[PDB]
């Protein structure tokens, strides 16, 4: 009838089977998942924190750079956590470093020492229009969030 064949079930080579593609993170659905808690109630990575109790210690981002004025520690933490930024890429650089030459490092005046000046103004990380009085900012009447609302 016929001779002897080697491969059963006609398994095609992983060599020529399709092409590689972007599921590098196939296993890292839970790679940044603690187990001190975790695996006690949940099995999926914890959502980012929004509130912290007093004396939380490690590095709430907002506080140190721009000195936050007189307000409760938890209040400041909640504000500077719920604020935007602290994430998302406008430049779209990767954390690995393979994408370093996608974006050229530019700092958006013409310095000229021929006759006068040449000091150049400061960088665009300082306030405008927001100049407003402290008694004004601190002293408003009721048009705030309700301190004790929490709908049930």
């Amino acid at each position: 009838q016929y001779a002897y064949d080697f491969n059963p079930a006609k398994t095609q080579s992983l060599q020529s089977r399709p092409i590689e593609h972007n599921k590098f993170s196939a296993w890292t659905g839970d790679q940044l998942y603690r187990t001190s808690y975790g695996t006690h109630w949940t099995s999926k990575p914890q959502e980012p924190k929004t509130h912290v109790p007093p004396g939380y210690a490690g590095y709430i981002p907002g506080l140190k750079p721009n000195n936050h004025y007189g307000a409760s520690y938890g209040e400041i933490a909640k504000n500077c956590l719920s604020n935007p930024k602290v994430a998302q890429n406008p430049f779209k650089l990767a954390s690995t470093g393979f994408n370093y030459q996608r974006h050229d490092f530019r700092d958006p005046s013409l310095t000229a020492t021929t006759h006068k000046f040449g000091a150049q103004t400061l960088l665009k990380n300082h306030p405008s229009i927001d100049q407003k009085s402290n008694q004004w900012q601190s002293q408003t009447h009721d048009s705030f969030r309700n301190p004790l609302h929490k709908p049930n």
């Binding site: 196939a26 296993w27 659905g29 839970d30 099995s43």
Partner: protein, 71 residues
């Protein structure tokens, strides 16, 4: 602490239930419910194993999923 239950399974009796019992004729310690009681409880007890078996089996399958992904 307190002694609320005379025995684990049954509470105290209502005053109407204890009508005589001045003479040692009714003790209530004779059950008349023991065999049916154990027969009933064993069934719910097998049920606890039954549910626990699916819980453990699902946990094991979830564990195996991770190795499948990492491969």
């Amino acid at each position: 602490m307190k002694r609320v239950k005379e025995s684990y399974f049954r509470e105290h009796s209502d005053w109407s239930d204890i009508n005589g019992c001045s003479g040692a004729k009714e003790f209530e310690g004779e059950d008349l419910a023991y065999d049916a009681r154990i027969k009933y409880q064993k069934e719910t007890q097998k049920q606890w194993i039954e549910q626990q078996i699916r819980e453990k089996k699902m946990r094991e399958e979830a564990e195996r999923n991770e190795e499948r992904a990492y491969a």
